[PDB]
C-alpha cells in the first residue's frame, strides 16, 4: 500500500496540475453535444477521488486503468489541437511519467 499511497500522491498532483481543468469534474452531457453518444465510460479526477477515499480500489492497476480512461476519452472526443485535447496530452504524459518513474 505504498501502492495506494502513491495513488494518492499522483492523484493529488494531477488534481493540482495547471492542465487539469478539463478533468476535475465529470463532463456535463447537457452542455457538451454528442458526449453522451460518443463516450461510453466517462471518467474524471473527482470520480477517481471519491472511489479512492472510500477505498474502492483493490490495487494500483485498477487506479491506473481509470486514469488512462480519462485520457482515452479525451482523445476520443476532442481534437488533438483543441484546448481540451492539448490539456489532455499534457496530463496524459504527466501521469505516465510519474507512474512509471515509481513502478
Ligand atoms: C463544448 C465543450 C467541450 O467540447 C468539452 C468540454 N469538456 C470536454 C472534455 O472532454 O473534458 C474531459 C469537452
Total number of domains: 1
CA radius of gyration is 13 Å
Number of strands: 0
- Secondary structure class reads mainly alpha
The number of helices is 5
Distance between the termini: 13 Å
Shape: globular
CATH class descriptor = Mainly Alpha
Describe the structure.
The protein has a single domain, classed as Up-down Bundle (Histone Acetyltransferase, Chain A). The chain is 61% helix and 0% strand. It is built from 5 helices and no strands. The protein has helices spanning 2-15, 35-38, 45-53, 60-77, 83-100. The protein is globular, with a radius of gyration of 13 Å. The structure holds methyl 4-propanoyl-1~{H}-pyrrole-2-carboxylate.
Brief rundown of the structure:
Helix content is about 60%, strand content about 0%. By secondary structure, the protein is mainly alpha-helical.
For this entry, give a set of tags.
about 100 residues, mainly alpha, Histone Acetyltransferase, Chain A, 5 helices, about 0% strand, binds methyl 4-propanoyl-1~{H}-pyrrole-2-carboxylate, Bromodomain adjacent to zinc finger domain protein 2A
SSE layout:
Layout: H1 2-15, H2 35-38, H3 45-53, H4 60-77, H5 83-100
The structure holds methyl 4-propanoyl-1~{H}-pyrrole-2-carboxylate (7MW).
Methyl 4-propanoyl-1~{H}-pyrrole-2-carboxylate is lined by residues 22-23, 27, 32, 74, 77-78, 84.
Organism: Homo sapiens (Human)
Subcellular location: Nucleus, Nucleolus
Domain Bromo: 1-102
Amino acid at each position: 500500500h505504498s501502492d495506494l499511497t502513491f495513488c494518492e500522491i499522483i492523484l493529488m498532483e494531477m488534481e493540482s496540475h495547471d492542465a487539469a481543468w478539463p478533468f476535475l469534474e465529470p463532463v456535463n452531457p447537457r452542455l457538451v453535444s454528442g458526449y453522451r453518444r460518443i463516450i461510453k465510460n466517462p471518467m474524471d479526477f473527482s470520480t477517481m477521488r471519491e472511489r479512492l477515499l472510500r477505498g474502492g480500489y483493490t490495487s494500483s492497476e485498477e487506479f491506473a486503468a481509470d486514469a488512462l480512461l480519462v485520457f482515452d476519452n479525451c482523445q476520443t472526443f476532442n481534437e488533438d489541437d483543441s484546448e481540451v485535447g492539448k490539456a489532455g496530452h499534457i496530463m496524459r504524459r504527466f501521469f505516465e511519467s510519474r507512474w512509471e518513474e515509481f513502478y
